[PDB]
Design a protein around this ligand. Structure first.
Ligand SMILES: CCCc1nc(C(C)(C)O)c(C(=O)O)n1Cc1ccc(-c2ccccc2-c2nnn[nH]2)cc1
Ligand SMILES: [Cl-]
Length: 463
């Protein structure tokens, strides 16, 4: 087959290495954009501007009411914002405060809409028309759209321009895995799948470095999206996947692509047996994505600085993956997933009840929540591939992944309930994973058996 021909020129070689580094290099900035809203939309302290002010029950001045005389009158005028730590954010620029608390959460929602939208349209287009031709278009779109939001004068312009950047980013991530797996032989088709996560996790460190140097949100937003233009120049000289050319009936160009390598080197829901598994796998993607993005979106509530608390989050992943790796090879994929989920949900519940006065305890069970979900989010993907049959494994993983973003959409929407009850958002934020722990019990497979090529062995393995 094609696998022998790919290894005929030497398999992985000088041509192969130079292609892998270039495509995976922007993945460092890939994770920067997801949590960029955290630093850009930071909310500072503020008090009403007189043309003294009442204080709260804890001894702090109010933020929406002003003394009628030196009755109670709403803050018709603006407010003076702190400049000791945050020179300027979108809250300081546009009045997203008081009666407009929910507006800031809305900006994140449409960002999650853009990434969801880019999975369908671009995925459909990436097969009808050449694969690498989509990658160049996505690279150019994210460079122009990123810099336009840095100069948006009106709030509706900011939301609209951010949505277009979300569509471009989704296609970049999807095409990175598809293009690389085509030119990598099956004998080394798993090493790349582990390097991506390490590069994905290292993105959290880069955001901390740039945030300290550039406090201004207008300059910080520009800096993150600035290098993407540079990657567009290098992306011109790529090589299209040879497997796709033969599939569409374009073999005549396949030989030329192969020759250049040598010189350089030297329907799913149509059967009960699948609908039972799909429903069980459905709640696993949803629950994990719900809790994961519900803890990273806010980190200023705790008593530690935002910069320091971020670097702890980006380094706790390394112990998390090591523990999960040992349990996978010793106890099993299913026992690891269930144990992690029940432990993660319990940790979140205890955080809400515990008072915020003691910061040391508060950050102890807040870091553990991020670390636990990091291990679970890696277990689910590995188990998913082993379960689905080869006929629909490619479609099943994509369908399962395209719904994980649906959980990310709901995550900031539930945060609007803080207006009524401040602790209320934490109640649902940990209740869902615990109820999801009762889904893994009904899964009728485990690990240690040969992979199912056909559906005929699914019932045989059950009995
Ligand atoms: C750390 C974030 C996880 C995540 N976020 C998204 C959003 C931003 C909502 O799109 C998605 C998604 O596209 O569905 N995912 C899935 C994902 C799962 C595992 C991994 C992973 C982690 C460690 C090692 C390997 C992988 C991996 N396996 N397959 N692809 N990546 C990466 C991404
Ligand atoms: Cl993604």
């Amino acid at each position: 087959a094609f696998n022998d021909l790919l290894q005929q020129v030497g398999g992985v070689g000088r041509f192969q290495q130079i292609q892998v580094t270039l495509v995976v290099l922007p993945l460092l900035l890939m994770a920067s954009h997801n949590t960029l809203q955290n630093f850009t939309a930071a909310i500072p302290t503020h008090h009403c501007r007189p043309p003294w002010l009442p204080r709260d029950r804890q001894g702090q001045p109010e933020s929406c009411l002003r003394f009628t005389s030196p009755a109670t009158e709403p803050c018709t005028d603006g407010w003076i914002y702190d400049n000791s730590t945050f020179p300027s954010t979108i809250v300081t620029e546009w009045d997203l405060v008081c009666s407009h608390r929910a507006l800031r959460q809305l900006a994140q929602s449409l960002y999650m809409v853009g990434v969801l939208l880019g999975a369908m349209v671009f995925g459909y287009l990436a097969d009808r028309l050449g694969r690498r031709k989509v990658l160049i278009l996505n690279y150019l779109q994210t460079a122009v759209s990123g810099t336009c939001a840095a100069f948006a004068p009106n709030f509706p312009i900011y939301c609209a321009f951010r949505l277009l950047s979300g569509m471009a980013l989704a296609g970049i991530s999807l095409n990175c895995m598809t293009l690389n797996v085509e030119w990598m032989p099956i004998h080394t088709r798993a090493c790349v799948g582990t390097l991506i996560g390490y590069v994905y996790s290292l993105g959290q460190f880069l955001l901390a470095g740039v945030a300290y140097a550039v406090p201004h949100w207008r300059h910080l937003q520009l800096l993150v999206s600035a290098p993407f233009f540079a990657f567009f120049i290098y992306s011109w000289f790529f090589i299209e996947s040879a497997r796709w050319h033969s599939s569409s009936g374009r073999l005549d160009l396949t030989l030329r692509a192969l020759q250049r390598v040598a010189r350089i080197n030297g329907e799913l829901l149509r059967c009960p047996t699948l609908r039972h598994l799909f429903l069980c796998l459905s709640m696993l993607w949803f629950a994990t994505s719900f809790a994961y993005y519900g803890l990273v979106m806010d980190l200023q509530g705790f008593g530690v600085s935002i910069y320091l608390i971020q670097v702890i989050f980006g380094a706790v992943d390394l112990p998390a993956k090591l523990v999960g790796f040992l349990v996978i090879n010793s106890l099993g994929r299913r026992p690891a997933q269930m144990a992690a989920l029940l432990l993660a949900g319990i940790c979140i519940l205890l955080n809400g009840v515990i008072p915020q006065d003691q910061s040391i305890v508060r950050t102890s069970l807040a870091v553990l929540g991020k670390g636990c979900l990091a291990a679970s989010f890696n277990c689910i993907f590995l188990y998913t591939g082993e379960l689905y049959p080869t006929m629909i494994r490619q479609t099943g993983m994509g369908m399962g992944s395209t719904m994980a973003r649906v959980g990310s959409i709901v995550s900031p929407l539930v945060s609007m309930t803080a207006e009524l009850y401040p602790s209320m958002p934490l109640f649902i934020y940990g209740a869902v994973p615990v109820a999801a722990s009762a889904v893994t019990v009904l899964l009728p497979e485990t690990l240690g058996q040969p992979l199912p090529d056909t559906v005929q062995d699914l019932e045989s393995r059950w009995a």
